[PDB]
Curated annotation (Swiss-Prot):
This is Multifunctional non-homologous end joining protein LigD. Mn(2+) 3 binds at residues 127, 129. Changing residue 210 to A/Q: Loss of templated DNA synthesis (in Pol domain). The N-terminal 3'-phosphoesterase domain (PE) has 3'-ribonuclease and 3'-phosphatase activities. The central ATP-dependent ligase domain (Lig) functions as an independent domain.
Amino acid sequence: RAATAGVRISHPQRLIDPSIQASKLELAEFHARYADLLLRDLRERPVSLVRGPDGIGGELFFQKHAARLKIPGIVQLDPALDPGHPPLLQIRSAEALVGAVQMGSIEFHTWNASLANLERPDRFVLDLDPDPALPWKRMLEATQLSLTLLDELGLRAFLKTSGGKGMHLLVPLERRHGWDEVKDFAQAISQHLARLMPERFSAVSGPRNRVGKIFVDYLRNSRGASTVAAYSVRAREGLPVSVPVFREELDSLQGANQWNLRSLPQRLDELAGDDPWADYAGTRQRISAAMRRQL
Ligand SMILES: Nc1ncnc2c1ncn2[C@H]1C[C@H](O)[C@@H](COP(=O)(O)OP(=O)(O)OP(=O)(O)O)O1
Ligand SMILES: [Mn+2]
Ligand SMILES: [Mn+2]
């Protein structure tokens, strides 16, 4: 089990994605090899699991809590954090990560807060959701415009493909605000963009509320909500991965799922050390009165 963080994998040959012949064992080995990459995000954050016992061709179970875990190393958080429910979950090691895969996990989504203080978010996320029949170029132009606004606000943003159909923008924040304050700020940004360019942006959820447009989703900022982790796999055809990218290579992207679990190695080799999010952990910023004025 040297290639699976010492974890025994049952039914190693069952297919996670028949389209590319990706087995459960391959998925486990991927999480073992890149555990450190995924842990850059999961190590100190509560995590929600997307489990697919029958592969992407079957259904998916979105799990937040668990009473009994057959995942050696997984951490069960204090029920007091979410009364009326079994313990939340936290993965802090390669063994726990692979163990989760062994139990059917395919995707990992983390909270916008870390164990240091789960009542003060350390980031907010803007998830751009486009109309299914909208040209990819629209997503690129919308992402560029969103970053321009963030620059004016004086906020540093970190971009990543979702692995699905849109882009994700993560903005770290000092733990000085409560959940409602951060969410309202994120919503204010979405509404601001919708007011400036109603032809491009929408601040209201629901496909019927973004026909031919892009919805700047701010709902992922609710306490308990989560967002797919950078470098994590998506339970979709081709097993695409959510990949951090430089703002300078944005216009060169051709799709939110251009990278997959098998092409990631090449991505990392091409980068050869260059890290799109090299300045993440070191970023120190907070919501200021000036920002509210601009919004
Ligand atoms: N297996 C799938 N194949 C195609 N579309 C999917 C699949 N699963 C989910 N979707 C679509 C339907 C959902 O309304 C939408 C939101 O996915 P979600 O993971 O919640 O946000 P996301 O940002 O991480 O991915 P996306 O870029 O697609 O929005 O994606
Ligand atoms: Mn989305
Ligand atoms: Mn969304």
